[PDB]
């Protein structure tokens, strides 16, 4: 599914990401725009042997299990395939777990280079949510 911006904003807000552990809404929308261009089916093979799945590019070394990555820890107890869905629920549930660590949103490299220090609330402006 490739989500619209406003459409992603209102979905994420239904899924409880506005102000979750200190990150405002715009953070999440911006992250998804640079991490996967709002495409729920996006996948990226990493050089280390891991793959990044879905709209928030969740990594198979640490968070989900794709059955093909060496020191796989599966910290979100979920097959990676579950994050390639139009329903964002499992992606959000895992993302909520990832950000509850002291690194916060810094786990997401695109958000880190393109979102942190930017007016991230621009991403939810001009939307009915």
């Amino acid at each position, epitope marked *: 599914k490739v989500f619209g911006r406003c459409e992603l904003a209102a979905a994420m*807000k*239904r*899924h*409880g*990401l*506005d*102000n*979750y*552990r*200190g990150y405002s809404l715009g953070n999440w929308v911006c992250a998804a725009k640079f991490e996967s261009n709002f495409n729920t089916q996006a996948t990226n093979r990493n050089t280390d042997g891991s793959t990044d799945y879905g709209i928030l590019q969740i990594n198979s070394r*640490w968070w989900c299990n794709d059955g093909r990555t060496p020191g796989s*820890r599966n*910290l979100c*107890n979920i097959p990676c395939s579950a994050l390639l869905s139009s329903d964002i*629920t499992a992606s959000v*549930n895992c993302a*909520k*777990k990832i950000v*509850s*660590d*002291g*690194n916060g949103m810094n786990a997401w490299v695109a958000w880190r280079n393109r979102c942190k220090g930017t007016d991230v609330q621009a991403w939810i402006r001009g939307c009915r949510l």
Partner: antibody
Amino acid sequence: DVQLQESGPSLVKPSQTLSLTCSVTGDSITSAYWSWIRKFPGNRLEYMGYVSYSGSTYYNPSLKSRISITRDTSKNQYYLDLNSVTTEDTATYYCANWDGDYWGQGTLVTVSA
Amino acid sequence: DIVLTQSPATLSVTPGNSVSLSCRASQSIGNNLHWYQQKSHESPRLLIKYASQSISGIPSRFSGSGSGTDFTLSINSVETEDFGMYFCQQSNSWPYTFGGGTKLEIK
């Protein structure tokens, strides 16, 4: 499958440090998210803190910095250290994973002179 | 901190009726409200996550709804295995907090 278990003293003197251990079987404690919760007499539950994947920790400010949570990768246990206890620390302590789906059984710790 | 208030504090029910328990949050916490059950001489058991997400292995008669500040947990026809304490908890902010609990008892 995951199995958790608390252990330690059931009786402590005021002002000492209460130390508790949680043994995990069925998964490496390394990298995972682990917590401690307590239930006071009168059913109040207090979330005490958690350790996470990077090793960062989050502690309830009600504990005013007398808490430490620590893990030892080789024995596959993680710990609770609570300094200067008082009678207000009397309670049922539980160990549990962050997700809340595996809890140990609990251990009553009474603080008395 | 986010204070979570539960009502009623006590609820008696003859097995087979339906019941719903509230949990109100002092501030909006989105969908970040979970529910637990605690029977006597036992550990709390996760029933519902993220306000309405079902959890494998728990009876389908339990269900939750709400968002923002108002959450409810419903029990379709109380079975005698259901009596005990019910607690809600939020994970939106740090320190995580629990509500005062509701006691569910045979009438």
